[PDB]
Amino acid sequence: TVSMRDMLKAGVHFGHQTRYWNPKMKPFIFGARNKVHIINLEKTVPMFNEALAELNKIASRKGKILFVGTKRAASEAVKDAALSCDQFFVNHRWLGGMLTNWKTVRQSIKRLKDLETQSQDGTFDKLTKKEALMRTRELEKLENSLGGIKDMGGLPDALFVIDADHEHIAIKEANNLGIPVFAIVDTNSDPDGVDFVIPGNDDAIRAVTLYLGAVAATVREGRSQ
Amino acid sequence: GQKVHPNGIRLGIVKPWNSTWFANTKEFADNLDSDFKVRQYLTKELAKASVSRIVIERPAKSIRVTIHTARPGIVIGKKGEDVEKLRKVVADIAGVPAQINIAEVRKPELDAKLVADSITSQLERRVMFRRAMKRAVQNAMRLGAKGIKVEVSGRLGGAEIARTEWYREGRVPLHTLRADIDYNTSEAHTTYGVIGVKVWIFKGEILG
Amino acid sequence: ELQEKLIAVNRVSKTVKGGRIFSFTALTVVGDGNGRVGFGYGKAREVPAAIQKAMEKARRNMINVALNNGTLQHPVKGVHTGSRVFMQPASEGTGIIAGGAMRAVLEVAGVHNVLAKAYGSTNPINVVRATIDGLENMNSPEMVAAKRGKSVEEIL
RNA sequence: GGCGUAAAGCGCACGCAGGCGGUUUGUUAAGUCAGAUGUGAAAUCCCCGGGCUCAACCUGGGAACUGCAUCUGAUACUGG
RNA sequence: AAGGCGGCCCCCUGGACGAAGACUGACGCUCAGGUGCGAAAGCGUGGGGAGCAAACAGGAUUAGAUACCCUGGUAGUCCACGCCGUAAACGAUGUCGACUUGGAGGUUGUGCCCUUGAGGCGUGGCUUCCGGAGCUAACGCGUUAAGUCGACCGCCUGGGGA
RNA sequence: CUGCAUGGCUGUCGUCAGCUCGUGUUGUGAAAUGUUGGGUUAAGUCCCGCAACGAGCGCAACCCUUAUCCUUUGUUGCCAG
Ligand SMILES: [Mg+2]
Ligand SMILES: [Mg+2]
Ligand SMILES: [Mg+2]
Ligand SMILES: [Mg+2]
Ligand SMILES: [Mg+2]
Ligand SMILES: [Mg+2]
Ligand SMILES: [Mg+2]
Ligand SMILES: [Mg+2]
Ligand SMILES: [Mg+2]
Ligand SMILES: [Mg+2]
Ligand SMILES: [Mg+2]
Ligand SMILES: [Mg+2]
Ligand SMILES: [Mg+2]
Ligand SMILES: [Mg+2]
Ligand SMILES: [Mg+2]
Ligand SMILES: [Mg+2]
Ligand SMILES: [Mg+2]
Ligand SMILES: [Mg+2]
Ligand SMILES: [Mg+2]
Ligand SMILES: [Mg+2]
Ligand SMILES: [Mg+2]
Ligand SMILES: [Mg+2]
Ligand SMILES: [Mg+2]
Ligand SMILES: [Mg+2]
Ligand SMILES: [Mg+2]
Ligand SMILES: [Mg+2]
Ligand SMILES: [Mg+2]
Ligand SMILES: [Mg+2]
Ligand SMILES: [Mg+2]
Ligand SMILES: [Mg+2]
Ligand SMILES: [Mg+2]
Ligand SMILES: [Mg+2]
Ligand SMILES: [Mg+2]
Numbered sequence A: 001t002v003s004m005r006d007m008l009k010a011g012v013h014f015g016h017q018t019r020y021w022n023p024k025m026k027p028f029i030f031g032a033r034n035k036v037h038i039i040n041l042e043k044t045v046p047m048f049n050e051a052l053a054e055l056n057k058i059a060s061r062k063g064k065i066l067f068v069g070t071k072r073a074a075s076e077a078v079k080d081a082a083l084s085c086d087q088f089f090v091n092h093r094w095l096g097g098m099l100t101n102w103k104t105v106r107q108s109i110k111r112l113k114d115l116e117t118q119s120q121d122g123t124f125d126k127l128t129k130k131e132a133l134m135r136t137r138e139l140e141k142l143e144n145s146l147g148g149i150k151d152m153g154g155l156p157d158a159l160f161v162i163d164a165d166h167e168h169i170a171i172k173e174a175n176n177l178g179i180p181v182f183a184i185v186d187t188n189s190d191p192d193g194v195d196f197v198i199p200g201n202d203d204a205i206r207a208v209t210l211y212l213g214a215v216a217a218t219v220r221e222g223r224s225q
Numbered sequence B: 001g002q003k004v005h006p007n008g009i010r011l012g013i014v015k016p017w018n019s020t021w022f023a024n025t026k027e028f029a030d031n032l033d034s035d036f037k038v039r040q041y042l043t044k045e046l047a048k049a050s051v052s053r054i055v056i057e058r059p060a061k062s063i064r065v066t067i068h069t070a071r072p073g074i075v076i077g078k079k080g081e082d083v084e085k086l087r088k089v090v091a092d093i094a095g096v097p098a099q100i101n102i103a104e105v106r107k108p109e110l111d112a113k114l115v116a117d118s119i120t121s122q123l124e125r126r127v128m129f130r131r132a133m134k135r136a137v138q139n140a141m142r143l144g145a146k147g148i149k150v151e152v153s154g155r156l157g158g159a160e161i162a163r164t165e166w167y168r169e170g171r172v173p174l175h176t177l178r179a180d181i182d183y184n185t186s187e188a189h190t191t192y193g194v195i196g197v198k199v200w201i202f203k204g205e206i207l208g
Numbered sequence C: 001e002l003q004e005k006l007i008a009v010n011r012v013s014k015t016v017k018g019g020r021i022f023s024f025t026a027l028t029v030v031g032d033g034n035g036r037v038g039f040g041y042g043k044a045r046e047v048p049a050a051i052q053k054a055m056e057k058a059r060r061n062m063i064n065v066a067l068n069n070g071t072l073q074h075p076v077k078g079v080h081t082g083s084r085v086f087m088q089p090a091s092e093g094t095g096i097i098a099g100g101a102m103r104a105v106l107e108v109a110g111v112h113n114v115l116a117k118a119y120g121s122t123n124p125i126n127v128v129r130a131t132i133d134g135l136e137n138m139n140s141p142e143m144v145a146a147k148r149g150k151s152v153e154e155i156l
Numbered sequence D: 001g002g003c004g005u006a007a008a009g010c011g012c013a014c015g016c017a018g019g020c021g022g023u024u025u026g027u028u029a030a031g032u033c034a035g036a037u038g039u040g041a042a043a044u045c046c047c048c049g050g051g052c053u054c055a056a057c058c059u060g061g062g063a064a065c066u067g068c069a070u071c072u073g074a075u076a077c078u079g080g
Numbered sequence E: 001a002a003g004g005c006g007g008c009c010c011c012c013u014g015g016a017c018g019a020a021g022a023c024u025g026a027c028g029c030u031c032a033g034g035u036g037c038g039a040a041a042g043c044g045u046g047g048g049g050a051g052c053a054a055a056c057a058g059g060a061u062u063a064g065a066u067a068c069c070c071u072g073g074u075a076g077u078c079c080a081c082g083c084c085g086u087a088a089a090c091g092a093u094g095u096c097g098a099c100u101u102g103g104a105g106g107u108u109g110u111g112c113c114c115u116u117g118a119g120g121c122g123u124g125g126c127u128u129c130c131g132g133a134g135c136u137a138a139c140g141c142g143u144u145a146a147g148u149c150g151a152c153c154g155c156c157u158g159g160g161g162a
Numbered sequence F: 001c002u003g004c005a006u007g008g009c010u011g012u013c014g015u016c017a018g019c020u021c022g023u024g025u026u027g028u029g030a031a032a033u034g035u036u037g038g039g040u041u042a043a044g045u046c047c048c049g050c051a052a053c054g055a056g057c058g059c060a061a062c063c064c065u066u067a068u069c070c071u072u073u074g075u076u077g078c079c080a081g
């Protein structure tokens, strides 16, 4: 649904230098310009559309989707995409064991809810005001970390990651839990732990917004369908 | 040789004294001997009864013994039969007119003296101490205790090397002064020696 | 329906300022009476907690073994770190001729007729890893037929 | 089965005997492979049976004795 | 080749590598025994001898101090020719060949582009570090393998005794 | 008699700021992480970061006393008018 010169305009073909690249990306690199590899958008387009087709299958049948990017550049874009398709997001640090130790993270989901109940609706005025500020910065921290999954309740069914090494931990937890992985795999990453590899740049805000808007699209289209 | 007695340290804050009377120095130690002899007698008689706390109070030269027990049916018997049997010997010991009231112990699994005596009776009839400590903790945390710690000590399974063991479930803040820590201690006189049992139960903080 | 066997318990230690702290390790293996086998290794201050952690990890991380009727399919070898292990398919009702940890893992594996031999170190953890690797890489006539792109009858 | 550190690479090298040897064709048939014949004593072991009331035991037939020799062939491999 | 080799000049001399071609046509690899080389210390004969310095002497230190420290100081260290034939003689890793993802350098050639600068693109030899698969008891090795294989040789078989 | 058969109680390191667990992950494993790092504090005190997330005993506070004020009651206490 996205053409090659669309990707070339957003900056998907860019990548990293030739002293940081993974030799597993040899079947995805077109050439090398200015001592920088170039991502073959000829193989990017049909793989990104195969990923969006499987995304349209799962979000058609109301699978749970978790968007994972904490690059401090796609944090707002991955939030706006997960609130577009009312899916779940991780914009700040992936906690170690967020999926595997779900039964422990659940007790902080409940703590974030009870603190939100107490302060907005609960009007949890009338405490020791030093505790009212310790409750405030706890609830701010927990909403800043676990707010994107606070309505998820169970394990998600597919994980879409912007960078396979900035978020390599979530890859391992999904590989353990059998959850399929959709990922924007740059030249400096390992394409083995990812079930659906999408070559492309990772730091470009236009390309991250292109990827996320195309996923929040084929999910909203599969939900409405 | 380290820890203070949590009742005696909580006696001014959240715990009441088990004897609440007044006397001058002339009749103080005599009243306190009479209280000791009656707690001795009532414990020997109501040993099979799950008695926890004998509260003694004497207004106007008339002793009033309030027995807290988990079952009053075995302490009373028929209506004024065994209570009256114990009342006439209380009045014999104290030398004053007596009065016996019985306060029922709701939830006997949440009372340290009852748990410690159940463990002691189990160890006396030769059960595994770890099973007894498990059942005391599971029953207390089920019945709603915010935290229990049990501890046995010495000659466990007839071993010649005495060691101590302790279990803990929930939070038991001993240094928190407003914590309602029910603490008591029993002793099992086995054929291999004496096994000491301690039990702390934290129900929660009194916000006075 | 998943039969469960503990192989060996062991007391380990950890020396600290106060002295020696003892702990217990438990090596358990589970299986469904068929190719689904899985082992676990738990450790705690107490033996029932260690067996329960071991059975917990063993019930997951199960592995699938393409068995024959009740025996293996070809003479397979397995190694892990001290334990070269040979095992061989055998005739009907000759029993499980196997040593120590391998008897428990093949019994919950649902095999019934093997000829095994554990060379090298017979540490139960590494030899049960070597048997899991041998049964996992044992391959069927169907898998080799689809692999070579021929029929089973062309393979014989 | 091993040889960095647990026992174990000569201090290094040249090099005779010895071991091994790229690729193609032709030829040989030595090795090799197949078949046949002779032999490989009997007993023993094994198989199928028979006989002592059963068994041990005794025993019939067979297979086996994985070997060697000669001859007839084969020529991929190794050798010439 | 190892041991090892450090001002500069000359004489004699060995080896390596590169570029195009030309040529011989398997002439090759390894190697018991054997032969040769083989640090320092040491030995022999003949020289030489500044410094350093075993030994030794004196002074201190110390309970003692046949030591460390100090002041001296002889063989020796140096040269020629012989002998010895050993070292933690170590990469504690035998030689030869083949294949197997990468990255940053160092050194030494060489080809091409307009060298439009000391650049840009390659292609050989040697070498250092990190590290992937794989291997390994682990530590770690990791295209210069301790990975995957082939050929030949040497060696090991509990610690002492030895 | 046996404190070297024991309970209980007590000293001590030491009112030192430390000691651990659950699940998760790493390692064949003993174990590790957490509990480390950057700052900071009396303090494993707090903040940030982090394959850890949490929790417990302890670090603190809750107790008593002293230090200022207010209200109430003034004898056996007080004496400004
Ligand atoms: Mg004290
Ligand atoms: Mg594990
Ligand atoms: Mg062995
Ligand atoms: Mg060996
Ligand atoms: Mg050694
Ligand atoms: Mg050695
Ligand atoms: Mg060598
Ligand atoms: Mg040949
Ligand atoms: Mg021939
Ligand atoms: Mg022939
Ligand atoms: Mg023949
Ligand atoms: Mg014969
Ligand atoms: Mg017969
Ligand atoms: Mg020939
Ligand atoms: Mg020619
Ligand atoms: Mg030789
Ligand atoms: Mg010399
Ligand atoms: Mg000399
Ligand atoms: Mg001389
Ligand atoms: Mg001189
Ligand atoms: Mg000197
Ligand atoms: Mg030597
Ligand atoms: Mg060296
Ligand atoms: Mg050597
Ligand atoms: Mg040679
Ligand atoms: Mg390396
Ligand atoms: Mg090998
Ligand atoms: Mg090698
Ligand atoms: Mg090795
Ligand atoms: Mg003592
Ligand atoms: Mg004592
Ligand atoms: Mg843990
Ligand atoms: Mg610590």
Ligand SMILES: [Mg+2]
Binding pocket: F037
């Ligand atoms: Mg720090």
Ligand SMILES: [Mg+2]
Binding pocket: none
């Ligand atoms: Mg704290």
Ligand SMILES: [Mg+2]
Binding pocket: B175
């Ligand atoms: Mg305190």
